[PDB]
Amino acid sequence: KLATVMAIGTANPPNCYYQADFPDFYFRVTNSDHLINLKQKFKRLCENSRIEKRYLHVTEEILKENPNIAAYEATSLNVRHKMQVKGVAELGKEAALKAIKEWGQPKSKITHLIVCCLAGVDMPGADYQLTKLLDLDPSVKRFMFYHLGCYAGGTVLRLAKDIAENNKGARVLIVCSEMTTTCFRGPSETHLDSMIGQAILGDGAAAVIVGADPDLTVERPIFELVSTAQTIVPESHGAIEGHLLESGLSFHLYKTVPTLISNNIKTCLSDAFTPLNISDWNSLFWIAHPGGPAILDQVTAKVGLEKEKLKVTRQVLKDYGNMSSATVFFIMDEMRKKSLENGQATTGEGLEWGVLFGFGPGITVETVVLRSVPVI
Amino acid sequence: KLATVMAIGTANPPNCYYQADFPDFYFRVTNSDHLINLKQKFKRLCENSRIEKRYLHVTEEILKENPNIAAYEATSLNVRHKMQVKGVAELGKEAALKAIKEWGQPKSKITHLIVCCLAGVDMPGADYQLTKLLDLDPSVKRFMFYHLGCYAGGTVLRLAKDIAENNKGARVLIVCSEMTTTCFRGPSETHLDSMIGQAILGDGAAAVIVGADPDLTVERPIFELVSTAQTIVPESHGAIEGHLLESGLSFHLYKTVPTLISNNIKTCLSDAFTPLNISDWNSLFWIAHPGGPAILDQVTAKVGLEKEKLKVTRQVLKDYGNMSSATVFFIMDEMRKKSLENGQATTGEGLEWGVLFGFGPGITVETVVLRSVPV
Numbered sequence: 001k002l003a004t005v006m007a008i009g010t011a012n013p014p015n016c017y018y019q020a021d022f023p024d025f026y027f028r029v030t031n032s033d034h035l036i037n038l039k040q041k042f043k044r045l046c047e048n049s050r051i052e053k054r055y056l057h058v059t060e061e062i063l064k065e066n067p068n069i070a071a072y073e074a075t076s077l078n079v080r081h082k083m084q085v086k087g088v089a090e091l092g093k094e095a096a097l098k099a100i101k102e103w104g105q106p107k108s109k110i111t112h113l114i115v116c117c118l119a120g121v122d123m124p125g126a127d128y129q130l131t132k133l134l135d136l137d138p139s140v141k142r143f144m145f146y147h148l149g150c151y152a153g154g155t156v157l158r159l160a161k162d163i164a165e166n167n168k169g170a171r172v173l174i175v176c177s178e179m180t181t182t183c184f185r186g187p188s189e190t191h192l193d194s195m196i197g198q199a200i201l202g203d204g205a206a207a208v209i210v211g212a213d214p215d216l217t218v219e220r221p222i223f224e225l226v227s228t229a230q231t232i233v234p235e236s237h238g239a240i241e242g243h244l245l246e247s248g249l250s251f252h253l254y255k256t257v258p259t260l261i262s263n264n265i266k267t268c269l270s271d272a273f274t275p276l277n278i279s280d281w282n283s284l285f286w287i288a289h290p291g292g293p294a295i296l297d298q299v300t301a302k303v304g305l306e307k308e309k310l311k312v313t314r315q316v317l318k319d320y321g322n323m324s325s326a327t328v329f330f331i332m333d334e335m336r337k338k339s340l341e342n343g344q345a346t347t348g349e350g351l352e353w354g355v356l357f358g359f360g361p362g363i364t365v366e367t368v369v370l371r372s373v374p375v376i
Numbered sequence: 377k378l379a380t381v382m383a384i385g386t387a388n389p390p391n392c393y394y395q396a397d398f399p400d401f402y403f404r405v406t407n408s409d410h411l412i413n414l415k416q417k418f419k420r421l422c423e424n425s426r427i428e429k430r431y432l433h434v435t436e437e438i439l440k441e442n443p444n445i446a447a448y449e450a451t452s453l454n455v456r457h458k459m460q461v462k463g464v465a466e467l468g469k470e471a472a473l474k475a476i477k478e479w480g481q482p483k484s485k486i487t488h489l490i491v492c493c494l495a496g497v498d499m500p501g502a503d504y505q506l507t508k509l510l511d512l513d514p515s516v517k518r519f520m521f522y523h524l525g526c527y528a529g530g531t532v533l534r535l536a537k538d539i540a541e542n543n544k545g546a547r548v549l550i551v552c553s554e555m556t557t558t559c560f561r562g563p564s565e566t567h568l569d570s571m572i573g574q575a576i577l578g579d580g581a582a583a584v585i586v587g588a589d590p591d592l593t594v595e596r597p598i599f600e601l602v603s604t605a606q607t608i609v610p611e612s613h614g615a616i617e618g619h620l621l622e623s624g625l626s627f628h629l630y631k632t633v634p635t636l637i638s639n640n641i642k643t644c645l646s647d648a649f650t651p652l653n654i655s656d657w658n659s660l661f662w663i664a665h666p667g668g669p670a671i672l673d674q675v676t677a678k679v680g681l682e683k684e685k686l687k688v689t690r691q692v693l694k695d696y697g698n699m700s701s702a703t704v705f706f707i708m709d710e711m712r713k714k715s716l717e718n719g720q721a722t723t724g725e726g727l728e729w730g731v732l733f734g735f736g737p738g739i740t741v742e743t744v745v746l747r748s749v750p751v
């Protein structure tokens with residue numbers, strides 16, 4: 001009896017930012033309207049990001065009250081931290097409540113809680129905060145993950161799988177709450193690594209309920225977690241780096257990131273699917289972390305995927321941007337929704353087997369083999 | 377077939393600080409000798425700590441190079457972080473190598489890696505760094521925990537247990553690498569509790585190998601992980617807090633901590649031991665996180681433990697101080713060593729069942745029921 005995802009709930013900050021209007025917003029609020037040459041470079045990044053809109057906690061009012069966040073490098077961690085700790089908990093609570101509702105069982109039956117946040121370090125953490133906010137059992141077994149990054153959607157499922165399968169009746173609530181107020185900063189002519197994140201990164205929280213041996217009279221399976229793997233891509237040292245500085249979280253990505261990830265996908269697919277006797281990558285439903293448009297294009301190209309395979313993945317990048325660890329769950333959620341709307345036989349686009357990919361710092365690739373559930 | 381601890385390896389920085397000489401050292405290097413009343417308060421915290429020595433990465437030389445670390449509240453996260461990331465990695469590597477040696481199997485057989493660090497947030501983390509430093513399988517399944525605190529020794533065992541028991545042949549390397557460069561700071565007259573961190577916190581790394589179904593022809597079981605639990609102590613909100621600020625990791629400890637923990641231990645013991653039909657707390661071997669002597673004295677008194685029950689726990693506090701999540705493993709290591717030396721039948725002082733306690737932010741209590749192995 002495999003660990004099964006039986007509920008998905010999502011949340012995003014109320015402030016919607018249309019990408020077509022973002023280069024004008026970003027340069028105005030950071031008082032960088034005089035940098036014409038750097039504005040054309042950001043317009044190029046935003047138009048080629050394949051993102052239509054993002055939901056961010058940062059507003060014009062927040063940047064006016066805190067001018068140290070509007071600059072590139074300034075001593076601003078304390079003011080970012082205060083908003084980040086409160087924001088991850090608030091967004092996480094909303095996503096959790098939606099997941100708990102779909103699940104259909106009372107929150108008192110949650111035995112384990114896994115919380116994953118890109119940033120927002122606090123002792124006690126977001127896991128404790130969510131236990132209190134959701135009024136969960138004080139004896140809920142918690143796991144708190146700070147600063148893992150974009151691959152963490154796979155990490156939390158990898159963890160939930162072992163918890164659910166080794167503990168009879170265990171019901172795991174996973175909350176991936178990503179907020180980018182920690183990494184929001186002004187542009188600089190001397191730096192070109194941190195400006196890419198201002199165009200691609202979005203905020204969002206996703207929560208899922210995982211459990212083995214579903215009570216089919218009330219619980220409704222969505223996807224089964226068949227196997228999980230984690231690997232470090234060969235010759236990728238220093239490719240995706242993130243440092244929590246006094247100026248907040250700073251991301252440094254090599255231009256080789258899409259090539260390193262894509263050239264390693266066939267190896268991850270082979271290691272995961274050979275014991276299941278599967279070789280056709282187009283026979284699988286795909287949930288891949290959309291780190292950027294280039295990663296998706298190169299994965300499609302090198303693996304030999306048809307245009308419709310990463311359709312849901314691309315749609316989520318288009319509607320929300322890169323929300324780090326939470327993104328794969330928004331894709332997972334939208335996949336079963338679109339599958340139902342298209343009248344398909346399973347939650348995974350009518351297909352039986354599938355794959356979830358998390359990409360991030362290392363370069364780390366999390367490979368989760370999924371099995372869909374039949375839909376009437 | 378229960379998840380079993382098959383190896384324990386430990387490491388500490390080379391700089392030894394005798395507690396009897398610490399008040400003078402600390403007040404001199406933080407330029408606080410003029411604060412006579414504050415010195416007395418700190419001197420008493422050190423004398424009542426029941427710590428004889430600690431090993432710290434921080435030196436007088438490092439404080440001279442970085443005066444912003446020596447100050448109570450000065451912008452210093454970046455300089456602390458540079459030393460913290462490198463320090464947790466090298467200390468963790470040393471502990472890991474010792475654990476791998478005792479285990480007896482090649483490092484290529486490690487399928488999972490759990491790393492727990494009080495601080496040193498890095499993307500990629502200490503788990504990645506240790507995978508590279510130890511040249512583990514690039515496909516090692518990693519878990520990285522930053523900023524959990526003092527209960528984490530129980531958390532990592534809780535995780536390792538489920539991993540080992542759900543994955544046939546899984547061999548988990550746990551590395552709890554604790555460095556205080558992130559929180560080492562000068563004293564404050566306004567925040568008297570901050571300096572408790574410099575009176576009690578020591579550096580140290582502990583590594584353990586956990587796996588189910590031991591191959592008895594090579595692997596040697598030390599303790600079995602029977603059951604695990606985690607709970608939040610009632611009415612304990614805000615008692616133990618830590619915030620990662622521009623000045624590094626802050627330390628907040630309210631005076632209610634010993635009473636809150638000690639008045640709740642019997643509930644943790646009852647929840648863990650009633651399904652096993654055990655009610656005599658003295659029939660158990662004890663591995664408790666030594667957050668302070670007051671916690672140990674009050675737990676001994678209210679639970680009704682014999683005076684020498686927490687002997688090993690107190691000895692590790694005496695020899696190394698509070699090394700956060702790594703401490704319980706140093707106690708676990710010393711317990712099996714002392715059991716062997718005292719000619720006792722088991723790794724748990726001759727006793728069958730035992731309990732491991734982790735105490736930290738929340739207040740969170742991690743309760744791990746242990747079973748000893750013959751000597």
Ligand SMILES: *C(=O)/C=C/c1ccc(O)cc1
Nearest residue numbers: 149150196197251360361
């Ligand atoms: C996830 O671990 C980080 C994703 C990301 C950060 C910064 C960028 O420029 C692009 C993607």
Ligand SMILES: *C(=O)/C=C/c1ccc(O)cc1
Nearest residue numbers: 525526559618625626736
């Ligand atoms: C164990 O719970 C230690 C907690 C802690 C250590 C250091 C800090 O500055 C804050 C909390």
